[PDB]
TrEMBL record, chain A:
This is Small ribosomal subunit protein bS16. Belongs to the bacterial ribosomal protein bS16 family. GO terms for biological process: translation. The keyword Ribosomal protein applies. The gene is rpsP. InterPro entries: Ribosomal_bS16, Ribosomal_bS16_dom_sf. Gene3D superfamilies: 3.30.1320.10. The lineage of its organism: Bacteria, Pseudomonadati, Pseudomonadota, Gammaproteobacteria, Pseudomonadales. Keywords: Ribonucleoprotein, Ribosomal protein. GO terms for cellular component: cytoplasm; small ribosomal subunit. One of its GO terms (molecular function) is structural constituent of ribosome. It comes from the Bacteria. Signal peptide: none annotated.
TrEMBL record, chain B:
GO terms for cellular component: cytosol; small ribosomal subunit. The lineage of its organism: Bacteria, Pseudomonadati, Pseudomonadota, Gammaproteobacteria, Pseudomonadales. GO terms for molecular function: small ribosomal subunit rRNA binding; structural constituent of ribosome. This is Small ribosomal subunit protein bS20. One of its GO terms (biological process) is translation. Binds directly to 16S ribosomal RNA. HAMAP family: Ribosomal_bS20. The gene is rpsT. Keywords: Ribonucleoprotein, Ribosomal protein, RNA-binding, rRNA-binding. Residues 1-22 are annotated as: Disordered. Belongs to the bacterial ribosomal protein bS20 family. Residues 6-19 have a biased composition (Basic residues). InterPro entries: Ribosomal_bS20, Ribosomal_bS20_sf. NCBIfam families: S20.
UniProtKB/TrEMBL annotation, chain C:
GO terms for molecular function: large ribosomal subunit rRNA binding; structural constituent of ribosome. SMART domains: Ribosomal_L14. PROSITE patterns: RIBOSOMAL_L14. InterPro entries: Ribosomal_uL14, Ribosomal_uL14_bac-type, Ribosomal_uL14_CS, Ribosomal_uL14_sf. The keyword RNA-binding applies. This is Large ribosomal subunit protein uL14. Binds to 23S rRNA. Forms part of two intersubunit bridges in the 70S ribosome. Gene3D superfamilies: Ribosomal protein L14 (2.40.150.20). It comes from Pseudomonas aeruginosa. Part of the 50S ribosomal subunit. Forms a cluster with proteins L3 and L19. In the 70S ribosome, L14 and L19 interact and together make contacts with the 16S rRNA in bridges B5 and B8. One of its GO terms (biological process) is translation. One of its GO terms (cellular component) is cytosolic large ribosomal subunit. Keywords: Ribonucleoprotein, Ribosomal protein, RNA-binding, rRNA-binding. Belongs to the universal ribosomal protein uL14 family. The gene is rplN.
TrEMBL record, chain D:
One of its GO terms (biological process) is translation. The keyword Iron-sulfur does not apply. One of the primary rRNA binding proteins, it binds specifically to the 5'-end of 16S ribosomal RNA. The gene is rpsQ. Belongs to the universal ribosomal protein uS17 family. Part of the 30S ribosomal subunit. This is Small ribosomal subunit protein uS17. Pfam families: Ribosomal_S17. NCBIfam families: PRK05610.1, uS17_bact. It comes from Pseudomonas aeruginosa. GO terms for molecular function: rRNA binding; structural constituent of ribosome. The keyword RNA-binding applies. GO terms for cellular component: cytosolic small ribosomal subunit. InterPro entries: NA-bd_OB-fold, Ribosomal_uS17, Ribosomal_uS17_bact/chlr.
Length: 78, 86, 120, 76
RNA sequence: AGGGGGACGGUUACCACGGAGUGAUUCAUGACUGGGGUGAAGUCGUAACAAGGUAGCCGUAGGGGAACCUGCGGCUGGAU
RNA sequence: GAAGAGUUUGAUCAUGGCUCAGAUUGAACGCUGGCGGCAGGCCUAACACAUGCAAGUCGAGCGGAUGAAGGGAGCUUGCUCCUGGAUUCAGCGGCAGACGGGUGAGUAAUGCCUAGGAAUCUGCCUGGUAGUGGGGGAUAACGUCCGGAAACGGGCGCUAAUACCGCAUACGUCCUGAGGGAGAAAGUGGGGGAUCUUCGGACCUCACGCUAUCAGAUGAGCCUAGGUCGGAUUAGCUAGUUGGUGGGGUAAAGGCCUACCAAGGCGACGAUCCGUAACUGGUCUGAGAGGAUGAUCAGUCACACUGGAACUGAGACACGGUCCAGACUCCUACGGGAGGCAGCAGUGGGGAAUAUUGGACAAUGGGCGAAAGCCUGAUCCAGCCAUGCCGCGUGUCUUUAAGUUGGGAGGAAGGGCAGUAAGUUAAUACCUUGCUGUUUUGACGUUACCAACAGAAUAAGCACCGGCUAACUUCGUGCCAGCAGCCGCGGUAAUACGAAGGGUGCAAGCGUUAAUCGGAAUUACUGGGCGUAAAGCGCGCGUAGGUGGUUCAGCAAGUUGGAUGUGAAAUCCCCGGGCUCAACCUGGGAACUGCAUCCAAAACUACUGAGCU
């Protein structure tokens, strides 16, 4: 059930993600286990795309968490 | 109203309850006779009576009608008083 | 119930717990009322909020007597307790539920609403 | 892992209650007040009399309203 | 054959709801009453403020249409 | 980082209350309205609820229902006997339904929050450790009968398995812990050349499954300390209560359950009773202390017409489960039945007052699935409402908004496929899988946004103007009619009341009703009082308690410093990044005055001891 997952922050027609590590027992936007770095597909000048830190991202894959479907092909952007 | 996804498990629960009521009672009548054995104070049938019971207390525990450490206590309660018959 | 001053339980839904017959309706020197007959009650005891109040001259159909009612083969059907169902001036029941059994002498043109609610 | 109180009642076997006193501050008044706390301590051998001072240890609960055992009679 | 073991049984404790008797404690209402407040003030009045035309006031008993008097101890917040 | 006025008086001073400026909300109401972006929208009846929808998923887990095609035989292209296998899906079975969602009724304390503690389970997930053999009995669909208009019931009779029960088997795992005893599993589909043959099977081989355990992650459960609302016009409460053991029992400690033994337990630091209320991160006013406060947002709790109860399951005492009881409601052909919107719309009904019987799973999730995908009123996103919060527009001869037209990104991660390479392979034979390049395709909101065009055509309102608000003629009315927050104004030239006539406040809003804090040192810890303004009991003895002369020494509870884990994320505070700008959005930190643990300190306090007068 433990999962790394895109989670909608931001505004309506203004997506912003957190890439939360969640439990799949909760909602998308509440009670995350850990926030590793973010995502922003409306990224323009000066805004960094994704703050993915592989110092902690190894650990949930090591302790047995999974990408959902898209989270696999954000790590494929490396 | 209710859904046939839940109306199917109306039968799937109470029929399963009926099988799990008997097998649960098949446990605790074997333990009662090895407490009747201690209350009769006759070791000469008490040893043969709970060695018929121990293959039943954990065989039910192995298949998830009861839990496996409920068996572990009752295998340690009855033995700790059969030893007291000495 | 059967006669005046007789006190009788309440078989329908809302209001009274005990009513007392103050008049047997029908004839002139009419002295008894069995199952299916119409009496005049007063509400001797009632629940805290219901459709009737204590002390109220009302009309009720007799549904369930201890004297009983007789069938055509000679057989009797005989209850443990007196009971009526209170009515309005339409001689339609006030409550929406009937408690206890009734007899088939009550499934007439006027009282089959009581029969259709009863758990007979 | 060290809580200290003076013995106030011992007339039951294997069980004793002490007053673990303290003096802590009042939040909006500033004056340090005393706040007495009356724990229950379990004795393994019942050797504590009224007026003794003991220290205790936390473990799994030994009864209802009792989750602290006796370590050592410090003084008397 | 049957036995073991189950199932429906039988009845034993436990208990929700219901029942009965008698109380508590709260809330609304109640004929009729008793003061209180604000008014507008008709009225017997002048009770206080000057030594307010009998100095006030306080306690208390006691007494009297009222705004009011004596006594006993009390106080000047009493002045010539 | 802190602004006060007006008002007791003939005037003064002091004590002391009133009314006022402000900023605010989940907002109403009275008015009048051009637009955009993000927001927010039963505060009352946890009131009753018509209607549709809110969790069905799977045939590659198993029996059994129906016959795409195609190749043929007859009749001669009408038809079926076949051959076959495409497909669906009501009945079993796995999993999920214990999540998402909603509401705040109950709860004054173990609920929440902060810290710590051990006597436990956890399906799917992830690392290994050992293992999938051999059998047996049922059972629905189906067949019919009975009851019923239907809904549905309940009689026997068939058959299956990834449904169940033994037997075999034991690296842990459990008991005794000497020795020994005990107990597991299920198979399905994509393939495969040599031997057995019906190379259907067997064996080989990966894929999903299956099991017995350990370590972990992730949840979930106990236990302790701390604090957490108003009352003494509530002072005693308590008997399974507080311990003890024997047993019983929970996944796990424990009077949790139990028998008997004893007489303990709680409480003036506020017990018990009584009224009230989800709590917190936080929020609002504030110089801060605080005070008030829990709408959106997030954590925990709690509930599901009301009450009791278990069942199944990894997980419930289960919101679209069952059972029982109650209240209510509904269909009846009187035989028998059914329902629970505090799920999204919506309806009454209450109220000052609050929205659409919407669009689609394209993004993010989940739920099943080998995969394709299949469902989701969660969500993404739309109508409706000035309800805030920003921007913006109503012209000084431009055309922005709006509208017409032409254009135009970003939301898409991947799926299909048919090569291409890889590594498990006994055989990169072959399947299955991850990689690569190309092709095919899928956007609810369908647009934002760019660039043309006609022409100022389509845009302002509100309240006041006696004072301390430097907005401040008259006309009508005459102690009338009225206005107003405090004074007051009106009793005949009215700056105070009704118009006109002008200004002014700030603007699609302006005002006043209401509530909160403030100024309020007007409950004063910071930071007030008491001879006469309100206030010293009429005074004692003294219980708890508050505080305690004097010196050395010791302790390290309070005190003091540092260390470490936190104090969730959000919010806020600065620096930024972006929407063309501002809201809004985030990135970074700052902040979080707190909590325990740890070591270091000894001037002072408590405590400890000997003293000193």
């Amino acid at each position: 059930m433990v999962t790394i997952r895109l989670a909608r922050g931001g505004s309506k027609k203004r997506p912003f993600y957190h890439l939360t590590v969640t439990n799949s027992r909760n909602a998308r936007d509440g009670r995350f286990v850990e926030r590793i770095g973010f995502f922003n597909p409306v990224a323009t000048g000066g805004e960094v795309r994704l703050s993915v830190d592989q110092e902690r991202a190894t650990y949930w894959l090591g302790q047995g968490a999974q990408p959902s479907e898209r989270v696999a092909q954000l790590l494929k952007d490396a | 109203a209710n859904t046939p996804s839940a109306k199917k498990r109306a039968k799937q629960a109470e029929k399963r309850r009926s099988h799990n009521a008997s097998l649960r009672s098949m446990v605790r009548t074997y333990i009662k006779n090895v407490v009747k054995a201690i209350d009769a104070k006759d070791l000469e049938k008490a040893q043969a009576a709970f060695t018929a019971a121990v293959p039943v207390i954990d065989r039910m525990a192995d298949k998830g009608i009861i839990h496996k450490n409920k068996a572990a206590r009752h295998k340690s309660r009855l033995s700790g008083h059969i030893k007291a018959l000495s | 119930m059967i006669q005046t001053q007789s006190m009788l339980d309440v078989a329908d839904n809302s209001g009274a717990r005990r009513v007392m017959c103050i008049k047997v309706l029908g004839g002139s020197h009419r002295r008894y009322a069995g199952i299916g007959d119409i009496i005049k009650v007063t509400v001797k005891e009632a629940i805290p909020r219901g459709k009737v109040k204590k002390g109220q001259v009302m009309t009720a159909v007799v549904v369930r007597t201890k004297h009983g009612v007789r069938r055509t083969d000679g057989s009797i059907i005989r209850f443990d307790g007196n009971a009526a169902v209170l009515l309005n001036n339409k001689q339609e029941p006030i409550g929406t539920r009937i408690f206890g059994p009734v007899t088939r002498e009550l499934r007439t043109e006027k009282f089959m609403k009581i029969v259709s609610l009863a758990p007979e | 892992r060290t809580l200290t109180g003076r013995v106030v009642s011992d007339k039951m076997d294997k069980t004793v209650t002490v007053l673990i006193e303290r003096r802590v501050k009042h939040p909006i008044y500033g004056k340090y007040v005393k706040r007495s706390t009356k724990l229950h301590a379990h004795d393994e051998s019942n050797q504590c009399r009224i007026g003794d001072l003991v220290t205790i240890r936390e473990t799994r609960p030994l009864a209802k309203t009792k989750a602290w055992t006796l370590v050592d009679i410090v003084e008397r």
